[PDB]
Amino acid sequence: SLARAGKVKSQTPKVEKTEKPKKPKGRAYKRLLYTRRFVNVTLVNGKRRMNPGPS
Amino acid sequence: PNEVKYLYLRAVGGEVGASAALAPKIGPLGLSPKKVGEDIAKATKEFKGIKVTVQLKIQNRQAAASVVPSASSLVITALKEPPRDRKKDKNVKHSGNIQLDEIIEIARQMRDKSFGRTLASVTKEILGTAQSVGCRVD
Amino acid sequence: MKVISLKKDSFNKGGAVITLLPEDKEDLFTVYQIVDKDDELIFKKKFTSKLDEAGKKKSTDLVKLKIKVISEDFDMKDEYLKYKGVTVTDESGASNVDIPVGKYLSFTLDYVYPFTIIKQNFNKFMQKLLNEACNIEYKSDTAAVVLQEGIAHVCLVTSSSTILKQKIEYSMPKKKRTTDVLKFDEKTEKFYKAIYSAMKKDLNFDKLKTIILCSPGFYAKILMDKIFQYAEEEHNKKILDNKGMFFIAHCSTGYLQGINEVLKNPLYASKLQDTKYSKEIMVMDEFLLHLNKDDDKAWYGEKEVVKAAEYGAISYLLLTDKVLHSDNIAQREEYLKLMDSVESNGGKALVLSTLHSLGEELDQLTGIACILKYPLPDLDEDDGEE
Amino acid sequence: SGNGAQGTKFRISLGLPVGAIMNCADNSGARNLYIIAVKGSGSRLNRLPAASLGDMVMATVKKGKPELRKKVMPAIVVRQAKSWRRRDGVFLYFEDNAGVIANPKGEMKGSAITGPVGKECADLWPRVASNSGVVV
Amino acid sequence: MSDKNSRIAIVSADKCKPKKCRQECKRSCPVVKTGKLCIEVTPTSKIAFISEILCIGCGICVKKCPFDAIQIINLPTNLEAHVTHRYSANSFKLHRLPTPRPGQVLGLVGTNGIGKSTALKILAGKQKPNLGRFDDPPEWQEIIKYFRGSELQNYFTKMLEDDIKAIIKPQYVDNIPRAIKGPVQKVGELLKLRMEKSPEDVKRYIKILQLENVLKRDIEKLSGGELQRFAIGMSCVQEADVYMFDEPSSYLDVKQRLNAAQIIRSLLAPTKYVICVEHDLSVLDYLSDFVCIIYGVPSVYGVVTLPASVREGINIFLDGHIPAENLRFRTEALQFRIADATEDLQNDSASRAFSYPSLKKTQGDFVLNVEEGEFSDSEILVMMGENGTGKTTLIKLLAGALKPDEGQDIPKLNVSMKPQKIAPKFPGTVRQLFFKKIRGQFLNPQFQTDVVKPLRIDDIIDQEVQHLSGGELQRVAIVLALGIPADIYLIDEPSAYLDSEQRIICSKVIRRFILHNKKTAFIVEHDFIMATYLADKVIVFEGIPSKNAHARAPESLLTGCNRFLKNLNVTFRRDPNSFRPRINKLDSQMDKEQKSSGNYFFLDNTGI
């Protein structure tokens, strides 16, 4: 059988990407990283995490 | 106006005028189709099989497949019932008596074009043509 | 197809319980037209393929799922029929045991294992297609007869498939000490009678075209003349009209082997009369004979043959493999009505394989065509085109 | 002779009966040609058919590229050795028997012909003319 | 697996009327049935368009076309590799181009419609190749890239930079009179202005070309041969590196065309690049160092081959086949009757035909002299010599069109005549004209082979003669002369405007009918080969052009050919393979030996 070839890609429903704030590139992005990771901190539920959704 | 006279000639059972005789049909004269498909899509759909005449008219940029006629047709009209048969019921031979006056009441309409002594001729005539009335009048 | 069972419950006058084994992609298409949504099938696969999580862990087994049908993914070219469904959940434990209830599950069909159809809507049309064959498309037309000096096989092709219908066989003449000890001629004489009876019954011997008569030795030729001897005896004009259904072949081997020895070897076959190109070729000839002398007595193409039929001028119907098996299902209903419709007005029928020059010529013509018995001018008008 | 032979040919002494082996004188990969038949030759009990200059034979390749061996093909005799006689009175002969592998129409399989070529063959088979150096 | 293939469709708009058919092309096509793109209707120009990508190659559309407007061919992807330029959708597309080389002359030969003319424009800088694409706004840059792998790449860089400006001798011979008057005023003016070269060049060029008389005449006034030569003069006089000649032999007579060839070659000596296109093999051989062959169907396509040698290219041409391309470009090979081949009959008919006495026709500026000769029945006589010799005058007198100054020729005979230069002056369409002459000649199978099917006159039938073309008109005229019965037929210069296949169709025509019908024919010609095939006797004309001339009685083929060729002093030994004339250079030992034998030409005949 060849049959199925590309079954799932062709049956996943399109959803277009969304339009979002442009992320700065380079040194600025490192800055954002350093402030997000180290400056004003974020959570520490138990220890620390880098992205969960509902917890 | 841009008109003339009939042609008196069918051919067939197939409607739409003979079949596609709803389409060659302007080709020396000056017509196109004024039932020559819609009253011919009511030709044989009206009196299916056997033929009868078609009298295409040529009346005004439009023909006219005229499916008038007379006897044979009006002869077996000697009846009162004939619940079809679909196809191939062994001939369904419809022949079996009729009414009296086979003649001035069923040939005084087909008179004229027959010639000579009316009844003795014509009135007699129609009779023999009853091959489908098979059993003669009574 | 091989139908293991088929019974009619007492509590249900209607439906049926069919255990069956599809054997080729023609038999996949058969299954398709039988199986309804909301029927049940119990087949096997191979589930137990859990988490981890507690233990290793799986187990294995060979677990059989009673799935109710919800949908199908059917691809004829690809030889792929698949049924999607939910577990029936046999709370009774008799069935469905070892499967975890509440979880969809599919059946990709295989030719390997049979399966059971618990049917609701078992109709007379499906029954035809289960016990006569179910190629409303028709690919084949063949029957063979291998005989060595001692063994014979009557073979045969199908109503649908390259699928045997009847493995006949007689007492074959074995080259005895004496002049060929007379038992030869009487026993051979029997076989013709046995094969004629089987083919008359099995078929409507107006569906098959071919008998290939194949032997190592003069046996085939001996048998042909013997056929037509007995033919003249009975005044069997079913045989005598028709020098073109028997075709006389030599092979080395003659078991079921012999057939594929004969066919595929260029000894005795090619595109000459094998009779599954027979009338297929002869009518597709006559079709272009008419159409190119612009006579209106041959017409072509899915649009144009359906209109040439509305005028009711058509005899020999030319249908294809390609337009059927290229991709499309539905569509071949339309043409099947259209064959009967046309014959209800006049004609036989020819399905040509498009895997060949002739089928390709007709395919460039939408894979559907006709020869008429009579001219019916301007069949391309009413319907609008050329 | 026969197909593709434009021209007639005056009789010349038969040099090569069936079984004879001539040098292959093209660049086809063939080393020799073994004569199994002469085209257009007639019939007499016991007579070997035998070819001559510019005759088309039917040969197999005894020595040569394996893709050429084990099969029968057409060739054309280009050099003789049995002496023969032309209508200018001359008795002449080559040092070897040799011909070139060819198709029924008369086209060379190869592209060169090594050595000389007798004119009676050149005159007979144009594609042989083409590929010939010294003629006669 | 299988080899690769393609489909190409070219449609002729002239042939197509969608109203009568309906857009039947779309309806009948199987691809469109399915919902595909193969034929798309263009609402604008109202023409059918066939896309090569979607087409099946079925050919169903071709058969259905009522006229014969569509052509689909299947090629092995021979054409796709080479694409240079295309005129538009479903039109002529050109493939490959001819190499230019400095200090030498490169030839081009092909049948009409091949793109030999187009190729010159591309090299000229006149037209920019689209590359079978969009390329239009000056995209010379892309053309070099397309040419990479070819020697033309260097040339295209040169052309764009405009370091060199090529000089072109225009091809269309019919078109030129309209374009120029005077050049402005009289040929002499043209030659003085253009002369960049030596003052010697004005005199020298005129002397060699035999332009002396013609200087005072205007360009519009010029006859065809004269018209050609002035153009040649300007192409020597100009100062440049690249001199392109496109068909320099057209209209010219036999003596003159050889003269043109020598002068043109002189350019190579100054090491100036030369390119040339020729329909004549005698001329082509002399001029060229290298030769290209252009092949393919007319108006459909035409590919240029890789550069070849002079001798080699000519040899391959005559075979009718090319090996790399693997195409049999010409359906039938050209052959000349041996004269052994001809039928042997005792000829006289009624004892010999009519005879003419000495004739003279004097204009007062030119005088023609004719020697008494005899004509016989069922024979054919060739007339040769340079133009201005009164070859045309002689035929006219026999036609009865002209009255002799002295001598008389009043024959009983019915004569049919075909004129040399054909310009339309008949109102009416082509079919009507030919039908008046004779119908029934139109029915014959011979006429189908030669006229009707090759050109497709059916399409021409409605067209006006004014609207017509040159070569097409020529074949039609020759046929028309043959249309009516006559004891004697007269034809004057049938070779004009015709390519190789076209002339040779004519050669078969005259010989076959004459033989069969047992009638006589006189044919005037410049083409060596045509004369050989048709004739049994020949008349040679001599003297000086535009001054006086002389004619001779008819003499055998061998005899007449020696005289004519002796005037030229070029021998045409024989090529053993081709059986073609092979030219012999001046002072030579081999050529010298022939002069002592008296053999200018050779055929399948006995001779040393």
Ligand SMILES: Nc1ncnc2c1ncn2[C@@H]1O[C@H](COP(=O)(O)OP(=O)(O)OP(=O)(O)O)[C@@H](O)[C@H]1O
């Ligand atoms: N304006 C145009 N539009 C479309 N096609 C054109 C155009 N001009 C020329 N052609 C095509 O290019 C080809 C022709 O010309 P070219 O002028 O290149 O021919 P040649 O090769 O010089 O032939 P000939 O010997 O007949 O003069 C033709 O077959 C024609 O189909």
Ligand code: SF4
């Ligand atoms: S090309 Fe032929 S068939 Fe197509 S529109 Fe024109 S005339 Fe009709």
Ligand code: SF4
């Ligand atoms: S050749 Fe066939 S496939 Fe191509 S355009 Fe014509 S009909 Fe359509």
